[PDB]
Every structure is written in C-alpha cells, then in structure tokens.
Amino acid sequence: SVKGLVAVITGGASGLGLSTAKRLVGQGATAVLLDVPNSEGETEAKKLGGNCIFAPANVTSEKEVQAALTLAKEKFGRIDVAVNCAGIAVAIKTYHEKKNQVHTLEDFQRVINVNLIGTFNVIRLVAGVMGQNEPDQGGQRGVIINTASVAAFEGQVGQAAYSASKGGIVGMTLPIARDLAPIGIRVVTIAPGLFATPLLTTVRNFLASQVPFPSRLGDPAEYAHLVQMVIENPFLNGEVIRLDGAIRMQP
Amino acid sequence: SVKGLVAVITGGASGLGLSTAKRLVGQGATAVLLDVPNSEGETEAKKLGGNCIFAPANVTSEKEVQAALTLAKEKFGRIDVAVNCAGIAVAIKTYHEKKNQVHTLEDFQRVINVNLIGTFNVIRLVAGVMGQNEPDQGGQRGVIINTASVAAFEGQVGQAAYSASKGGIVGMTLPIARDLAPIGIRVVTIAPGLFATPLLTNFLASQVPFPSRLGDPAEYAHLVQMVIENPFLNGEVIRLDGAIRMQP
C-alpha cells in the first residue's frame, strides 16, 4: 500500500504525472505536483483535494526544486517517493534535407536540460531529503521513479535530442541505484510507448494503429498503475520497464 | 483486480509458482498447480482450499499439459491467466580443461527441454483455450507470464544451458505477443535475480545492491499480479533482482 506516503511528482499538472497523482491520492498518499507556473498545477491540485498541493518549480533550477522539496517536507513531514514526469519533446531531424537545415545546438541543449539534467536535478536533491528518513523494516528510505521512453531504444526520425535525453535517463538508472543502495533508496525507470496525453492528443491514430495489443494509445491511468506497483514492490530496483502494448517503433 | 480469474501455474508446487498461487487465491482468483507427480502439489493445493487444485503434468509432455488444461477449463470454466514457473537448473562448464570434461549434449538438451520447450508447449496449448474467452471490454482474452532469469543477460560460468534456455524465453516473448495480439492475449516475461526457493538447494545475498538479500517469492507473486492487472504491459521482459548484475 501507498497509503500515507508522500510523493513529489514532477510534470504533475498534466498527462502521466497528473494521472499518477490522481491514482496515488485516491489510494491515500499525499502528492506534491511540481510543474511550471504557467501549467494548470493549481487547478489540478485543488480538484484533487487537500492531500495534493502545487509547488511551482522548473526542474532545471536548483533553487526552485529545493524550494518545492522544502515545501513538501514542511507540509507533509517527509518525502517517500519522487516520480519524474516533467519533460518536453521536439521532432527535429539532425539534418533536414529539403530545407538544408542543421538541427540547432540550442534545441538539442534545451531538450537535454529539461529531460535529462532536470530529472537528475530532482533525483540528487530528493535523495538527500529521503536520506533523512528512518528506514522502514526492510531498510528502505524512499523510491525514485523516472520516465524515459521507448525512444531510448527505437528513436524515430526527428527524435535525436529526445532519444538522447531518454537514453541518458536509462544509462544513469543503474549507477544511481547503486549509489543510493547504502541508504535504501530504490531507483526505477518506466519507458512509456505512445500514451494519450497532451503530447499526442490521423497523425495520432496512425501511431495508435501500430500498437500490437491493446491497439490504441496507452491510457495515462495505466502508467499510474505501474508507478503504484513499482512503489509497492520492494525488490524492483535498477531496471527500466517498457509500458507500450508491445510496440517497436519504426523510423 | 484478479478476483474471479482462473490461473494455471506451472511449477506451482514450490517456490515462485507456489507463492504466486498463494497470492492470487488470497486475492480471489482460482489457481491450478501444474507440476510433476513427485512434488507436494496435492498437499499445497489442499492447504489453499477449493479454489486451488493440483493437476499433475510434466511440461515437456503435450499429452499431460493438454489433459491439465482441460481439467482446469472443465473445473473452473475457462483459463484467463497462465504463469510458467516450471524450470530446472544445472551448473556445468562448457569445457573444463583440468578434468578435460566437455559438457554433455544430453545435459544441455534436458535444460532446454524443460525450461524453453516446456514453456512454449504450455503457451501454445493455453493460447487456444484463452482464445475461447469472450473478449473483455478492452478486447483482452488472457495474459501469459513466463519466467526467464537474469542469466539470460549475465549468465555465469557454468550457466550455459540455463542461460540458453532463458535467453530463448526472452527471445520469443515479442514474437509470441505479436502472434497473439489479434486475439487479445498479452505475453510478458519476468526475469528474477536470486530468490529464496528450493531451486537453491551460502554467500549469495551479499551481491545484491538493495535490498541486500535474496528475493522473497511473494515479491515475484506481487509482480505477477501487477502484470495481470496492467492492460498495457506486453511483449516486455522485467528484471526483478534488487539491481544485481551477475559476475562470472
């Protein structure tokens, strides 16, 4: 059970992170939605009730992420779970032939900074807050769950920056789990396929037609169920799980 | 949830398969333990009550597996879930120079037959029984979960036969999920690390990063329940291993 756990969920105002918060709060946990000020964070935290609050923060900022973790610790006393869902996507070829356009350096850097450096910035700072917890009976002080993508493995045309960012999350999953093993913090990454979030919601239903079964986009509530299972299962650690209806992405 | 689902669990008399049966029956499902006659299948099925029965079957025998599946379908109405836990292990080097000892072909074949051919035998026969179910509201007719091992990825010295058998389970997970997509059967594989079961029959726990101990069979059972419940998990292998990576 997740009842009573405190979860900080980056990208919590929409899509996968919002669905996660709704499921964990419906199961008794407390959630802090960490998302940018221009998001619907405050609306969604109101709708989810008194066990969910909004902490405005950009995951690339050390100050702002420290302030949101400080608010979560003040309000709820501790942090037990962090879910990294904050992310952006772009579709830009390395070299776009009809326009003779090279991918810019700044667009690659922006996707790296939000998705990869932003996820490490939350990990590193939440690990220190989870380390102040007393261990449970099984030695555990917290669980950190990251969101990669099947683009880490079958990146499509146009996905170089996105796939590098998500490959980086995959690549650092095991060394962070090994780093935090002495303090009892599990680190697991989910790699979603194609899900019905603002990111995707003809262009869309072609995509969807490619998922072997079920033959549709993923429902965010399915991601949220996998996050609850990862929190609950004490032995799942250092691993990346595809959640994708058996799709393999073509170019 | 899993309430009302009917599961067939090979290797169900012991270890990971027994723990899986205990958990699903505790959650309201029915389980049929498929295991060899020499096992404690009957006593464990009686202990679990009327929603658990024992069907004696060797998974390399299509006659015995098909009889066990028919007993399950007649007793409980249908089959919704199959979990392949039947398996054996050996630790035999390919070649051992000091004793000039070559791994026998028979010892390799035996592990492939039980672990890999036996798992495929169950999959192919249970698929058509699941195909008889009316699809649920999301189109699903059943879920098949296999047991590979981290030895599919970091096989140790002595594990050539076991690793070939478990790498075959890994390798066929995707094409069987693609085969069965049109009738709504999901296929997922769990790759355990080191677990506390009779398969071990004295320094193993210290290698695991965290938790730094052998896995508890009930943690495998919990992951099985999650795979059964999640409609979108398919064609994937999941390591359940405390972040271990095996050295030689």
Next chain:
Amino acid sequence: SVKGLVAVITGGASGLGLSTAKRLVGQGATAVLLDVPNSEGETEAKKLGGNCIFAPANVTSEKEVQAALTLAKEKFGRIDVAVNCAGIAVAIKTYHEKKNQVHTLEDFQRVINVNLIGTFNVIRLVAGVMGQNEPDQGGQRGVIINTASVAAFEGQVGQAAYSASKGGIVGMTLPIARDLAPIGIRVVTIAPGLFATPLLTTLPDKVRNFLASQVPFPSRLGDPAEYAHLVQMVIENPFLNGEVIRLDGAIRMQP
C-alpha cells in the same frame, strides 16, 4: 590477418557460411565446410581449392560433428576458429486464428535442435580441440563466432521458434565466453538482419519482394560478403568477446 588459421564453418555449403569460407580462404586461411551430405558442400569446397575441404556432418549429431572436427584437426594440425552458420527457419504462428491451428511441438523442437542445440554441440566439442593449441603471445587459443539474428530482439509474427533459438544463442554467448576465458577462447555472436541467401524463401512472397524498403541504409538486403568481412574483423580483434553485434543496415523488425 587470418593467413594460416584453420576455420571450421558450419552451414559452409551456402549463404553466409559459404561467403565466410570464400573470404577467409582468399585471405589465406584454411576452411573446413561442415554441412549436410545432401548439399553443394563438396562442389563448393572443390571450387575453393586445396585449402577448403568438405566435412559432411549434421550439427545435431555428436558423432558426426566430432568426426568432422577430428578430420580438420588431423588434416590441418589444429583448429583456430569455429563459425556457426548452420541453421534453418520456419514461419509458423503460435496460434493461427483463421485456420484454428496451433504450432506443433515438434516444429518448435526441430528449430531449437538445429539452431540452438546444434550450435552448442559444435561449441562444446570444438572448445577442447582449441584448448590443445599453444596460446599465442596474448594468451589466445581460439575464436568461436555464432550466428543469431535480429529475430532474437524483434521476432516477427510467425517467428516464435526461430527467435527462441536465436535468443538462446544470444543468452549463452556471455556464459560460454566466461567459461572459456581461462583457456583463451573468445566467443562472439553476430546477429544478422536480412541477407540475400537461399534462406529467404521462408518469407511469404509478397513479403520478401518487400524487405528493402524496411532497411534504412543501405536500403537493400545484406550481401553475404558483408557478413564474411565482419567475421574476419571478429577473428582479428583480440579484445572483442562476450558480445552480440547486429549487422542489419539499422533495421528494426516490425510484426
């Protein structure tokens, strides 16, 4: 350089194993084609000249493989390299809903037996032969190269048996490398994508006439000589071990 090495190449009468033998013999190695009697083995070994001989053997037979290895080792004095290319393919769904047909157990067992158990059979029996070699200055006594397939990773509809057998070769590559590390035999597996060989008749027809469009670049079937070049690089590079290499034009296979 492979000049002077003695290679035993199973599946040597055709396709990838034949091209391998042609390249290695053209670079000065000696090659023993191991392939079934009912094949072009003999003719191809004659066409390749005196450094190429045909040893009839089914890789599922312990006695035939041992007799082919013994023939290589007596004739040429030693065995330095083994290449496993013998294999078969079938396209059979686990369950075919339209025909209400279940994959037979014997069709799965036969593909496992040739592709997986036959490769292990060659490996286990050649390992002791290579361990009689004097180790070179780097400690090496031999190299074993196996052929899996991208089907170990992206098995298609109908490829359950094939992908199980090739997944088995991938899964055992590391433990066999670790087993043979103390006597200096490297173990490497190549996973080809789609190659222009007599094996292609397995695909539908309107599906084979279609392959090239799926390969990003080069946008065509692989040429067997490209597999052979990769085999030569694996034999030459001393530090390649316990690894599987995809050789596929960057394809990822769809269902």
Next chain:
Amino acid sequence: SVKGLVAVITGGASGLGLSTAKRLVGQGATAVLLDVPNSEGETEAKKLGGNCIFAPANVTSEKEVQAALTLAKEKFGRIDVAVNCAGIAVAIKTYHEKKNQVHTLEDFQRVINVNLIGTFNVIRLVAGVMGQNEPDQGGQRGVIINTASVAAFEGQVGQAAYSASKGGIVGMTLPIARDLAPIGIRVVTIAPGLFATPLLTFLASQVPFPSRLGDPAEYAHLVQMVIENPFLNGEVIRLDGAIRMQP
C-alpha cells in the same frame, strides 16, 4: 580499405582517438585531430606527417567545430569519416552520505556538455559536410562513429554523470542513423570497456579475456572495420574483453 578517406577524429590528441588516427593514416587515410588548443594535438599531427593535421577546437563550441571542419575541407577537400572520441569523466556519487554531499548540478552538466552535447555538435555539423559528397557506388556519403562506454549499461557507483552522457550517445545512435539514411551516412557507436589511456593510466584483473586493459590500437582496428563494413549501421558494439561492470 580506408585508403584516401578523410577522417576528422575528435579527442585525436590522445588515447583512443590518437591510436585511431595512427592506424588510419598508416592505412593511407588522411586525418584531422580535433582537440583542445592546450592538448598535444599539433605535435602528434606533425609526428604523423603531411596526411595528419590538427584543428584546435572544443567540441562544445559551434564556432570552433565549424572552423575545424572548414580547415579539414580546405586541407583535404572533403570529409568522409568522423570519429567522436573527445570526452571526460568524473567519479562523484549522486549523494554521498559520509560527507552529506549531493552531487553538484554543475559537475553533471559539464560531463553531459562535453560528452553528449559535444558529440551531437560534431555529428550535426559534419553531417552537413558529408552530405556535400557525391555518393559512392553503394550510395554512401560518410560514416560517423561515436564512443559511448560500457558505463551506458553497467554504470558503477560514482558514474551517474558519465553513464548519463554515454547512455545518451547510445540512445541517439539509432534515430541519427535513421535521420541520415536518406543521405547515405551510417552512424555506429563503440562502447569500450576499460582501456589503457590517460583516462585510466585491479581493473585489469576484472576483464575475463584477454585479462588486461584494452590496447587503444584494438579500438582503432574496430573503427577501421566499421568504416569498411557497408552494412553496419545504427548499432552499438561493446569492445571490452567480456567484462560486465560491478558497482
């Protein structure tokens, strides 16, 4: 044969990139060592003679890489091969309890910027130069080889930033190969284990066989075979003596 090809090798002043340049120039190719101004690049380029020049540049700078590729084109006429070996490493835990010390953001960013963004920076700019080449008889215009690491798969304690950077090179190998397929540029990544370069010079004893650090010239051989094999694309190759890294 690589005879006549022009290769730009980042990190060319030392270690794996230098051994690659030595091997390729000894097989008749031409090589441009792209490495920082403070490296020994110019002296190593003179020792290899007229077919090897140095282009001082930091791979994280657009301007300096553009200048380096223009120098390569001006000297040798075209670019056929790029090899990304420029890289750095740190050993810093995500959180170190005994010191109560969080890994700094800046140390992680530095490693990501040189290893990952710097490799993409070279890839994107060299792809435009290789697209100026007429295709060979097989449609190819160039070959780009990157250097990841086994730390992309078994990153050790202290390797978070390095493993993130190297996992990003692995993750982007396939989409970049797919992006550049229509212009005939293959993209392949090598993931070395443990090699005897300045980055390292009991680790030797953990390699199954050969039981030693890798010799840079074995990485160089593997680069030459990737350049020569027309069908290797979108793949990552471990070059590691069968090691699997423990924590």
